[PDB]
């Protein structure tokens, strides 16, 4: 309720290394983990390089891509607040779709149910990789421009004729951790394979 | 604590709560010990407000139950810094050592902050925010933390200290500290009063920390938390949509935008408004809330789980 | 005699100073730390010491001076470099050898052992003289002859006159007796900075400050003995205008005063002045330092010296004016001076006023600025000098709302308004015609008409053209040049030509380095007269535009001509060009 | 030859201060050592003195002090830091005590800190460039030996990583023009974890013969945090003007220094100044900065790149707004660029150097420096404007030049600014990269480039 | 509105955003006006 | 039609919205600095005056003994 | 009063009003005598006032209380007091109507602020003294007509 100019807040931020800055706006919208991803920071991102590399040698890139997507969406939110989504192109539209999916699937957690009571690192990194792979493949597809339209036409094509993958992506948060890592990992690998089938099957008939 | 500003009917809604407060468990609840034995402590109140509360308590048939400690505005200022303490001591003796559920209505805590300011200034002490004493937080903690059930006794103490923001804000030291200490905040907004809704309670600023404990399948409908969390989200998003449409025009709005605006209208009119003498059963309130929610399609109801949807989306 | 008792940072309390006076400067400690007295509570005093007080010892001696913050004037004041508290930086550096300024230097302001050539006036050994009488003059250097005025508040019948010869300041060049008691005067005069210099009568300013730049000379003229304001923060316009004033301005002397700016900026400017050289109208080549005095107090200097630098400079300018010379002061950064005053006030715990500055900031700024003006001298022979202040302002972010900016705009008569937008658009003068103004034009109109009765009408027409320039600007912005009429198109073209040919200068180019008022007046005539002569013919705009190509080239070149040919030749050329343009406009109509 | 009296007249303890009773002839800023009752030793500084009284501010806190067992042994000194030419290549604590597992400094002189100011007559305009290895600094916002250029940052922004990169990669541009370069590195009030980062960087840098890491942690006593930048500036001044060596100084988080001054001033019962910060904070920062500059009589120089944290991510804060006037530049770190995952997030377009023209020249650096800098500036602005337009015009109506500027903006953001943490870049190859980005536009399109330069370099 | 440091920051941010949006809308309007002028010339 | 709508929106933003906000920013700046900062100094100044009065009273009482 | 920001011709308007001042005439002895206070005016403005008043020929009925910006700041506070006291004597105790004029009242406000800040008094809005209302009353609240006397201020 008070800005960072508060002397206690400034003193803490002058020393504290990781700031999980919860925003009251997210609390109004009933987003329960409520961490504002624009203002939070973690100066430990460099020391954790070894652990991230050994766990999954491609997590850093997907995390950076997710950060870029979130920042781009927050950037053009002001432009949409003025003009509207009418001028939004294929890239912007797919970026906002992925940002909304990330916001409601990844960044949320109920914590009052076994779906989100405790998310292990493997499940979280698999969700991130799935979402980022979907974003990258969709961007490549709309950049292909096959069928003389491509673009937002291809975006609608993948949101309608390929929306089952989208629904499975947005429901991936419900993978029960009690099933164990060898089961959830297999399920997410299958979902990744199905996503790779899309944007290639969609490109088969040139949209 | 009910947060209010000058002119809003905080006293009226306090009296309504005093007249209507009661147990909810399975709708089953003589109950003389269940009678809340309200202890009303008024500090710095215009004589009209004191007469109003007196007449309301007399008319509601509770004159053999309630108790009034009054410190009127014309009465000496210093007694305002003792009256709530006396009220809380009396409540503690009536509840813990006598086994009666007790309800307390402290009135105009800003009129207590004023007494603190006067005493601190008269002693030439170091001031704090806006010149208030540096230990106002300690005094407010001492005056609020004296309520709550106790394991060894069957009694209880539940207090509703109403508060008046000076310039209708929250950054003021007294409402700020009260929000820090107290486990809740009910907000009465001038915007709702200007639109002529008798309970002007703005449901978006509102908050109760112990809300997740009072509700539950053992004492409420299983969908209560879902219902609340959805109405809150739709109201907040619809308010954002209305703010956007205020500049982009009613024509630029989409179908979902129109649904959100209609939800806002029916929520602020049919739902929030209630009779000055008519209550609402919790299940009736949930039915009204479900009628409000069912405007949107099943897809848009993201917060509500499908299990509760199947038992309630049709009814 | 006098020992310290309490040393709390800058504040110092010294006992045994019952005879001390308020605001009397004092020497503190063995290191001879210099500080000013503030409160004389009890038999004790209270002193704020300018330099750092670290290392002071209780019961260290305190030595009184019996004088407020004062400046030692006289010969040798020109050319040198001085600190805020009147400390000669050059001689200090030479004497100490090293670069750092010693903590407690005691070098006198002017070298009292150097010799200057002295010669008295025709006054007799038993004549009568009074304060302000010019009894001798000294050739401090070539072409900057220095008059020796008998100090004010001193008068009496002459007793001794030193015959012409070689002398130093320590010599008793003059001795006289008013009553039976006799006093002997040297060539050094001390005067407090806060107290202004005595005047006989404040005249009315009646002569423009010819800065050599056409935009300042004609569009927004400034008069001798008149305040000026510059919003100088970037674009080097302040440096450009200061160089123009030093080299070409009518002033016989210039006293730059720099307070609390960037140290390297003062280094650059103080290395630029010696490189600056100005040619004499008689064909001689001189150095600007021979008529320039510089008072520079960087940020590292004590805050009190930073506040006192402005008063030191204005007192020096007044002393120069005491012999009737026209001298121009240049406050480098009044915003820095105001910040220094704010820091001093915060040290004194004075009650804060608007935006944190002390409540007397506006009053003190007005008191400082009120010293400028053309003034009749004190004492004979009859002569009249002037002091004009061109003190600049540095508003925060360009928002002319800070109390310093507001007070300066309320006091200063002429504001020239350098614009960063023009600097971005590569404009050498960088003077924004839309915001600049000259409130002294009404008083200067007498000379303006005496020089040329049509010049004032030309200036009014040019102001009207500038006012219509923005009108045509939004006209083109909203519908374009198509909707403009033939007369409107002619007016727009003439406004553009004025902006890009005469209202703008070329500075670096030798032909446009200096713009004489004669050339400026002829250019203005050749522009305005042609504008009218084309205007009343409405004739197709395209046709006159096609057939006035030679006239347009002549108008453009009316500013390309170098001043080498002199006024008689350039005036004749401009008159011939104007006559040719008039003939072309009238015959073709 | 005088042994200082060890008074035992403690007559009052409160907070960090201790008030002696009957000290005979103190000094205002004397330095005093305290032997507590338990035998432990503390060093304290003497604040305002009075009749036989002397309030002492004690380092390391004042816990355990008693008014009948604590001796306060004076010295009669003003903290002359030990200074020598062998001070280089070693890490020092906040107060100067070495912590590099080495010996204490054997001094060639005992210079008093807060040295006397330079005579403004003796200064000289700064000249020549100082290579930093970061393309955004050495191309568009060039730096000259003698400037005082702040590096405005904010909490969370990777200020310290840029500090380490500057400390390592700093060098003299004059390598191709045809080793007297030393980097006094000062860090005030760093976090407990970044201390390990600084120790690692200065323990494996590879050029240890150049740097001197004055280090002052956050949990170190405050007065140490005041003295640390002054010690660093004194050592740099010695190595510059008393040893004829080019010197670079990086002051880290001078906002913490301002807070430390605020803490000290309040303890002296002085009324707080504007916005809480003392009014003399302007004088203090001017005293810290103005020690730089180039001296005519000496071949050395001092160049400052003080890193300042701007609270609330705005410049209206008293410390940044105050230091804006004293200095002549601003190199902002932008939060959005950090979000965009560009490792050096320097907002080049907002950033500028008030005297970047001196660094650009013919003798020093390369001829085309100013031209390429201006062209890059203008083209970046145009690209940002075109991206903003494409956000609202659908990008179908954009002309060819609009797409050229869009792709140039993307390339400049993802290939030029995003230098690696260890990719040292000489100014020549940095300008070669700039030309690589520039040559996309037609030779006639680069309007801001003067003639005889396009013909020289546009051919690649 | 109630005055506070956070409120001042919010108002400054709103002003900056309004200025940016105004510039963007002016650019869009200029482009639309250019297109309208071209269409009018074609019709003529 | 589109140009008319866009021009109306742009003119409204330039005239109404920005000129509404900027006075609000000025009033908020004045309320904080013009009042709260001034009061803080005045409160502390009165406190320092109280301390000085206490010290003077103590000194006078000691001298009277 | 006249509300007019800095740089506006309000001084010229005041001079024109004072020179052209007269009764409705719908008498010369009781005609308008003008007391012209000048708090904190510039030297050029002072010379302008003197010359303009001497030119209109109404010097016979106009009193100037000039106080330049060079004069001490405290001495500016007593200038309106003296001007109004002289006006009171001329109007009530002699009869002739007085048209009191005070220029640059903001200068008087600044003088009050400086004097109050010197003594460290309780500050009102914008750092001005908390009794500025009473002082501006004691300045302004003297215009009126007294029943028993034919004067008017």
PDB file of C-alpha atoms in Angstrom, chain B residues 227 231 263 266 270-271 284-296 312-315:
ATOM      1  CA  UNK B 227     -18.337 -18.098  -5.486  1.00  0.00           C
ATOM      2  CA  UNK B 231     -17.478 -12.495  -8.060  1.00  0.00           C
ATOM      3  CA  UNK B 263     -22.478  -7.982 -14.296  1.00  0.00           C
ATOM      4  CA  UNK B 266     -26.573  -6.036 -11.507  1.00  0.00           C
ATOM      5  CA  UNK B 270     -29.380  -6.150  -7.026  1.00  0.00           C
ATOM      6  CA  UNK B 271     -26.629  -7.777  -4.932  1.00  0.00           C
ATOM      7  CA  UNK B 284     -30.173 -17.062   0.050  1.00  0.00           C
ATOM      8  CA  UNK B 285     -27.151 -14.797  -0.389  1.00  0.00           C
ATOM      9  CA  UNK B 286     -25.272 -17.601  -2.145  1.00  0.00           C
ATOM     10  CA  UNK B 287     -28.290 -18.184  -4.392  1.00  0.00           C
ATOM     11  CA  UNK B 288     -28.303 -14.499  -5.344  1.00  0.00           C
ATOM     12  CA  UNK B 289     -24.549 -14.660  -5.952  1.00  0.00           C
ATOM     13  CA  UNK B 290     -25.013 -17.687  -8.208  1.00  0.00           C
ATOM     14  CA  UNK B 291     -27.713 -15.845 -10.149  1.00  0.00           C
ATOM     15  CA  UNK B 292     -25.241 -12.995 -10.623  1.00  0.00           C
ATOM     16  CA  UNK B 293     -22.484 -15.394 -11.707  1.00  0.00           C
ATOM     17  CA  UNK B 294     -24.585 -17.380 -14.188  1.00  0.00           C
ATOM     18  CA  UNK B 295     -24.606 -14.375 -16.532  1.00  0.00           C
ATOM     19  CA  UNK B 296     -21.244 -15.545 -17.869  1.00  0.00           C
ATOM     20  CA  UNK B 312     -24.618 -25.294  -9.059  1.00  0.00           C
ATOM     21  CA  UNK B 313     -24.334 -23.993 -12.653  1.00  0.00           C
ATOM     22  CA  UNK B 314     -27.930 -25.100 -13.355  1.00  0.00           C
ATOM     23  CA  UNK B 315     -29.771 -25.408 -10.012  1.00  0.00           C
TER      24      UNK B 315
END
